Amino acid sequence: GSHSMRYFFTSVSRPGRGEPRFIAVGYVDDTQFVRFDSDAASQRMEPRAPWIEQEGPEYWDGETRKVKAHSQTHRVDLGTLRGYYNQSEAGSHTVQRMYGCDVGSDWRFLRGYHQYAYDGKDYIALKEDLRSWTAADMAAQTTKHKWEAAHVAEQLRAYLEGTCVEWLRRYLENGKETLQRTDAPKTHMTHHAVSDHEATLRCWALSFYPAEITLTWQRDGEDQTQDTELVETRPAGDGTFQKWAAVVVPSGQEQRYTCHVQHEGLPKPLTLRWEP
């Protein structure tokens, strides 16, 4: 499979309460591996995956400094953004930023992205070609024009093709035990009488990694995405993911229905039938 590395950044201004809240989280695929929270006591980039703990002092000092330069830029941007939109300098605002790289099965650069939002809406984003930007509004255009003049996409593109991809691969080799694993879903179904003419069937998928999974229902072998209920995939909290799909059925027809689980960690798609 193809793999990804992603960093998420949220900075929230807090007028009256104190200096802005900054939080950063680093992902490789669906595993968190680092973090930084300005409100925390360490003031360090902190390891949150066993495989990153391998890394030496040169590394943590490096990351720590960089995440603080990241935090400080956002300190400035909150001010600049507020100014651009002529906003009462007294109100809590949010800047979010996400950037990173994907690689293919061959672990070679595949895709690059950089995305920026202000107060929950798109602000600016590097386009797929990694050379130009999509600006969401007149404020964003000002940033675009500024960033175009100073050849910023060029610097970013350098990183997303180069460093990002190279260190992604480093994290995959070093974290081979876990990042490159697949945990097949543990499945089972449950039955629930709701009326004298109606019963709820539920299909369960637990312990699976990565979060990507599909559970669909079929009557007599024909799909029923129309009549089911998927729940948003959710974290167990131990590095794995969970999901259920439910369908309400007429009494006595339970045998007609089947759940079809598809997950990277399975050899061929799982059919679970209501066999008595």
Place this chain on the structure above:
Amino acid sequence: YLLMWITQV
């Protein structure tokens, strides 16, 4: 591995 820097909006 973070960006060595980010340029102000």
Place this chain on the structure above:
Amino acid sequence: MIQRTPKIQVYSRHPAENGKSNFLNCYVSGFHPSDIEVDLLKNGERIEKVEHSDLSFSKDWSFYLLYYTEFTPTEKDEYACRVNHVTLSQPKIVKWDRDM
């Protein structure tokens, strides 16, 4: 200023079994702004040493968080998750349903 009301799922890390140590999860997602109060309740009372995930968001920029605590479900103790958010007129209380 988009404002999205948080979805809430309350569940245990592992399948529930009475008197076996487990973890109670509240998963709050799809919200904005990020400021959100979440408490896990045991029989109405706020559990004190409750840990939670780092703030992160999805394709549409909406926020998500995992709150969790170590716990031992017995058949007498009722568990729930109380979320308060600027989009919610009043705190939303979701009860834990184990044997679903």
